[PDB]
Design a protein around this ligand. Structure first.
Ligand code: UR7
Length: 182
């Protein structure tokens, strides 16, 4: 409808796949080469489904900060025959607050879904499903089951991936440039 949705759409059309694990279906953001991100609670194994195709998981790491604190960011390298468009230049370098963000989801259940979530707060610490978690972004929208892995963008930046909610607020794990400096 406007330049927020235009940027969100451009990312979803080239840089997302549908990932299925034993824990369900997730929006999964491709970042560069065969490297993608998913919420750690997806429990990625040796094998994953990518757009309903059996795919070997070449390499995988759950990111924890330098106090061994869960971040909720799992980086996956997929045994896929095709690279993602490199979008690392759209990643913030620092922890920050943002205005006018969009959460975009693409699954079998919620295709081509875009939610204007508005202002995003650098929330920091969250007890997320019982797990102490750092670098959480918060937005005041009542996000539901099915949105985990959803991409959070502003015009020009990919800032995080949706990892949970409390019925009134939604929460995303920050994406930082530093996570993907190969
Ligand atoms: C499995 C995996 C692939 C790529 C990266 C990004 S990097 N090479 O800058 O650390 C992290 C990973 F954990």
């Amino acid at each position: 409808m406007g330049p927020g949705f235009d940027f969100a759409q451009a990312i979803m059309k080239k840089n997302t796949v549908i990932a299925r694990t034993e824990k369900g279906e997730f929006t999964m953001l491709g970042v560069y080469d065969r490297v993608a991100v998913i919420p750690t609670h997806a429990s990625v194994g040796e094998i994953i489904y990518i757009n309903d195709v059996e795919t070997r998981v070449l390499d995988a790491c759950a990111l924890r900060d330098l106090t061994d604190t869960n971040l909720e960011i799992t980086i996956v390298k997929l045994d896929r025959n095709q690279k993602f468009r490199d979008i690392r230049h759209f990643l913030p370098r620092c922890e920050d607050d943002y205005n006018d963000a969009v959460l975009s989801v693409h699954t079998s259940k919620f295709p081509n879904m875009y939610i204007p979530v508005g202002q995003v707060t650098n929330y920091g610490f969250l007890n997320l499903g019982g797990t102490p978690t750092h670098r959480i972004l918060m937005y005041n929208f009542p996000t539901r089951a099915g949105q985990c892995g959803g991409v959070v963008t502003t015009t020009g930046k990919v800032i995080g991936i949706h990892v949970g909610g409390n019925g009134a607020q939604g929460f995303a794990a920050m994406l930082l440039h530093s996570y993907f400096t190969d």
